[PDB]
Amino acid sequence: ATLSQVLDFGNNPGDNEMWIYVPDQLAANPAVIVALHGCLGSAEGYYSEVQDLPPAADENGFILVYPGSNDDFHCWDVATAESLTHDGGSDSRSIVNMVQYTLDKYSGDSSKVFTTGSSSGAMMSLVLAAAYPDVFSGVAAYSGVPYGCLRGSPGSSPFTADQACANGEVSRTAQEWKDEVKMAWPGYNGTYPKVQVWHGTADSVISPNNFDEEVKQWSAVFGVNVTKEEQDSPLDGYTRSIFGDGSHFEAYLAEGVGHVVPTQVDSTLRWFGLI
Ligand SMILES: COc1cc(/C=C/C(=O)O)cc(OC)c1O
Numbered sequence: 536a537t538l539s540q541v542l543d544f545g546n547n548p549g550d551n552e553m554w555i556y557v558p559d560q561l562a563a564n565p566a567v568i569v570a571l572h573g574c575l576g577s578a579e580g581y582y583s584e585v586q587d588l589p590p591a592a593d594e595n596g597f598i599l600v601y602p603g604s605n606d607d608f609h610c611w612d613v614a615t616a617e618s619l620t621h622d623g624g625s626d627s628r629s630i631v632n633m634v635q636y637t638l639d640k641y642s643g644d645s646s647k648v649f650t651t652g653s654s655s656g657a658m659m660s661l662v663l664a665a666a667y668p669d670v671f672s673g674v675a676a677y678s679g680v681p682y683g684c685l686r687g688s689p690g691s692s693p694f695t696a697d698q699a700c701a702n703g704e705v706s707r708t709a710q711e712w713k714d715e716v717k718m719a720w721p722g723y724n725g726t727y728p729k730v731q732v733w734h735g736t737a738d739s740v741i742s743p744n745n746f747d748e749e750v751k752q753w754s755a756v757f758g759v760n761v762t763k764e765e766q767d768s769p770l771d772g773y774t775r776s777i778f779g780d781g782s783h784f785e786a787y788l789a790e791g792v793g794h795v796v797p798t799q800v801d802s803t804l805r806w807f808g809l810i
């Protein structure tokens with residue numbers, strides 16, 4: 536199996552590309568994992584960057600969808616009201632449409648849709664968690680920024696965004712970050728997907744202060760405190776923080792790691808309940 540492009544997946548308000556990896560042996564009613572590239576990258580680039588994901592698809596029979604952004608220096612829109620809001624439009628709605636296309640065409644399991652991404656893609660994974668909790672069951676954000684930090688910014692790239700968020704200059708209370716999540720879908724009554732975040736202490740692109748802000752955000756959303764910590768988990772220097780009963784939010788801080796934390800497929804697939 537290799538990566539191939541979907542020319543028409545339906546309405547595409549973000550004007551994005553869609554690339555798909557379908558293993559030769561699919562599960563019955565396969566899961567779908569959306570895998571999101573970083574700024575200046577591409578769908579084909581992220582497919583080759585996270586080399587462990589496609590073999591994991593082969594072994595477990597789930598589908599990988601790689602959306603691609605060709606706007607704003609190949610960055611995901613995490614700034615406009617449209618992209619930040621449930622059913623708003625722009626990139627987030629295009630990605631959801633890619634998901635709906637995949638579930639319909641490949642008889643996928645709509646209760647097993649997940650997303651993971653790095654930097655800009657991690658930022659979008661948290662947008663998808665807050666704005667589309669009715670679509671995604673779990674997200675894994677590697678080296679990103681809390682949901683809503685860039686709201687109202689004139690762009691989402693190193694050359695167009697307000698740089699306060701990437702510089703780690705934005706700090707808000709857990710309650711304020713929870714309020715941000717609720718603004719993604721005002722009046723939403725339901726639950727949110729499992730959230731797993733990662734960051735490196737040496738990240739010179741996206742400040743590790745953003746890790747603290749993401750922790751405040753999702754601990755508040757789920758109403759949980761740290762209950763367990765694992766050192767050198769899953770790798771030396773990685774500190775794993777487990778919240779509440781462990782079913783909704785966990786966080787990893789990697790000592791000495793920069794931009795970005797390499798995807799840990801076992802940790803992320805187990806979080807999604809797929810292995
Ligand atoms: C959202 O605004 C930003 C996104 C990224 C993303 C980087 C990446 O995806 O690799 C970097 C920024 O400044 C360095 C920045 O201000």
Ligand SMILES: *[C@@H]1O[C@H](CO)[C@@H](O)[C@H](O)[C@H]1NC(C)=O
Pocket residue numbers: 722723724
């Ligand atoms: C949430 O519940 C209220 C009633 O309590 C209802 O008016 C509203 O439509 C619900 N929200 C959604 C997104 O269905």
Ligand SMILES: *[C@@H]1O[C@H](CO)[C@@H](O)[C@H](O)[C@H]1NC(C)=O
Pocket residue numbers: 758759760
């Ligand atoms: C979280 O910690 C705060 C501060 O100690 C406490 O007030 C709150 O009750 C805790 N929440 C729990 C244990 O669910």
